[PDB]
Amino acid sequence: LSKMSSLLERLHAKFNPWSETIKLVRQVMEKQHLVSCLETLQKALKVTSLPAMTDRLESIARQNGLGSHLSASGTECYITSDMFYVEVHHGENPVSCPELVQQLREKNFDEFSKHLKGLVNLYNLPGDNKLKTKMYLALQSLEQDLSKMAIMYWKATNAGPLDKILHGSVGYLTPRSGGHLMNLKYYVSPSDLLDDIILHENNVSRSLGMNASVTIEGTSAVYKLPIAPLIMGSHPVDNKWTPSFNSVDLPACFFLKFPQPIPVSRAFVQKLQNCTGIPLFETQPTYAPLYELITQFELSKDPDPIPLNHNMRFYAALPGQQHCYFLNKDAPLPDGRSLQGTLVSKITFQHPGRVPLILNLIRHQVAYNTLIGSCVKRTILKEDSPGLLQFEVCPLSESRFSVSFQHPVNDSLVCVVMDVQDSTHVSCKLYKGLSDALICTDDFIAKVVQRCMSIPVTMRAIRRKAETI
């Protein structure tokens, strides 16, 4: 069909040729990614003979805007600011990264181009010359302190990688390599730990979970940051930080950028800000219902051309039974205002002292988002007469929500109120009428949820356990 249309295009070229196409490309030149992807596609064997290659590397720099100086055929250096690296300012060449060496030795010039882009973004700092060198030094001190704090947790408890990610000081931390900055993994959702029962080992993927990056970024305001490692003396349990001043008032703060903005509620902003004065969003922007933002984050994880047009009526299909969940945004909280929140991408912290507290609040907000997020789905359940056991989620207190469903055996509405008090310790209470059939034991539901994943799922277990009895 279209393979015969590709044969038709070849016939058209013959009527016209490959040489003519090359001439047209040359004329366009006179007037990156795809190549490397399809190059691995080809790679039964790799390019052995490589006459120039230097010319392509010069071209890659030209497109980047970097400056290339080459000493001999073997060594070529791309130099800008302190971002100087050589394939054979204020610091020694740190490492022969296997990551960069492997990509260059194999036919992946595209991957090398991405790595340079990362290095350029890290050093897109407004400050230049001496101011930039000190600012980088501050980032190095923060990295050393965060690394030590992670080491202390491992010494105190020999926890497995999963425990460190879910409930540990800092988080699984990978030290910065080339352009990539330090990544602290705040949370690994139970459903996504399982892929199509993954055992993490020390080989935990960079993106196999929720990850946050620590970096220095320029700010309009002026702040004091440690310019030397501040954990000179460490109390054996937890950490002790020697007081500031050393430090200098650089016009920037340390940041905890999140790759995908996390929807966060107004209550969390107050709970977090209690610990840290630094204004998170400073200029008060927009603040609408949280449940809408949670749906957008979940729906946009996988992008499709047609907007779901859910009307907050998400439909879920499960191995046994069919369920419809109404998210009920706009339900009044005790204060009389619907849960309202704004996406947060960057959180700024001066020192790491308040960081353990800030992360614990974030873990709770992320966990609540994941349980409510598991329901959001692209289901076209239209005219569904059989099954269709529908249940709904009204926000009744910041950090609490109620899923309401008809009693599985009897007829009265029964509601499970779940509060995300902890990241791994949501506490749920079943509300059932005085005359009703014992629907479930709170512990059995917990065991099924922990062994498996998500909350659309929790409702199935509640229905199945009641029916089995």
Binding site: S6, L7, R10, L11, A13, W18, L24, V28, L41, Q42
Partner: protein, 74 residues
């Protein structure tokens, strides 16, 4: 099967040339499809080249045997 072998090789050559033109136009998943469909075709043509190698062994001796018998019979 010689005519079929020639045609099979010709199909690979013309489609590869058109793919080069498409790559010049490009600079996504259509070129990814073009690459993986070309993969199957030229890998089967590499198996036909392995058969051409054995044609330069067994089939070559067989052809020589027929030619030698002709002259010997005469």
């Amino acid at each position: 099967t010689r005519e079929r072998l020639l045609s099979a090789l010709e199909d690979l050559e013309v489609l590869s040339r058109e793919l080069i033109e498409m790559l010049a136009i490009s600079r996504e998943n259509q070129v990814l499809e073009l690459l993986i469909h070309r993969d199957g075709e030229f890998q089967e043509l590499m198996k036909l080249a392995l058969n051409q190698g054995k044609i330069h062994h067994e089939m070559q001796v067989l052809e020589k045997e027929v030619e030698k018998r002709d002259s010997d019979i005469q």
